[PDB]
Design a protein around this ligand. Structure first.
Ligand SMILES: [Cl-]
Length: 225
């Protein structure tokens, strides 16, 4: 309307949904199944951001070092199957939307913005978690960690949106909570909101220099009309 933006994109974990509690519960149950020590929720948080394989590798590497044990490859595969199972079961157990997320997405949709999710979370979990929280109907595109060959912080997912919706990068506003989001946006040429409530390796979101830094998801409305 009075902005340049046609499409607004969002990360999922740490931006729309506070999923850390269910991720931590799931990963710790799987660690227990391979007789490895369990991690604090802050530690688990620091492994999140780069997809479920990297998350799994960080978990097992930490726990093995803690315990002075190693896993065989078959044990590691087993760990990953159990972690996948538990999480699938706990997608919307302790997890909740961040404050004002649904109301804000509805407002933006009402204004005519195309809305998209771009996350490194496995693609298989994206439509289910959005459906569980009653917001799947608002999104015109939902990209996860297996959806394209390169993922955030590579700008490719942003270029895919430009192509699919017929846009210049400058017509996309992105909303994220980690440097993966902010670096991808800077590289593609998209304006980017950094949220301060999400998962960024214990690093302040200001360090990656987003275009805006917000404590409340509803503040996005102040910059979209
Ligand atoms: Cl991730």
């Amino acid at each position: 309307g009075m902005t340049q933006f046609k499409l607004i994109g969002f990360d999922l974990d740490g931006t729309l949904v506070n999923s850390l509690p269910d991720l931590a519960l799931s990963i710790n149950s799987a660690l227990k199944d391979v007789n490895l020590p369990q991690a604090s929720e802050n530690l688990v948080m620091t492994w999140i951001g780069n997809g479920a394989d990297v998350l799994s590798q960080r978990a097992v590497d930490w726990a093995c070092k803690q315990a002075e044990k190693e896993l065989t490859e078959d044990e590691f595969k087993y760990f990953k199957r159990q972690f996948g199972f538990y999480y699938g079961e706990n997608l919307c157990n302790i997890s909740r939307l961040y404050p004002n997320v649904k109301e804000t997405l509805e407002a933006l949709k009402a204004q005519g913005y195309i809305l998209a999710v771009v996350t490194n979370k496995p693609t298989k979990h994206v439509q289910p978690i959005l459906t569980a929280f009653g917001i799947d109907h608002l999104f015109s595109e939902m990209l996860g960690g297996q959806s394209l060959p390169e993922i955030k912080p590579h700008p490719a997912p942003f270029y895919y949106l430009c192509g699919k919706f017929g846009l210049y990068p400058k017509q996309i506003l992105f909303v994220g909570d980690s440097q993966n989001d902010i670096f991808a946006a800077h590289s593609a040429g998209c304006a980017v909101v950094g949220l301060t409530y999400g998962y960024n390796y214990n690093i302040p979101i200001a360090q990656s220099k987003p275009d805006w830094i917000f404590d409340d998801f509803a503040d996005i409305l102040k910059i979209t009309q």
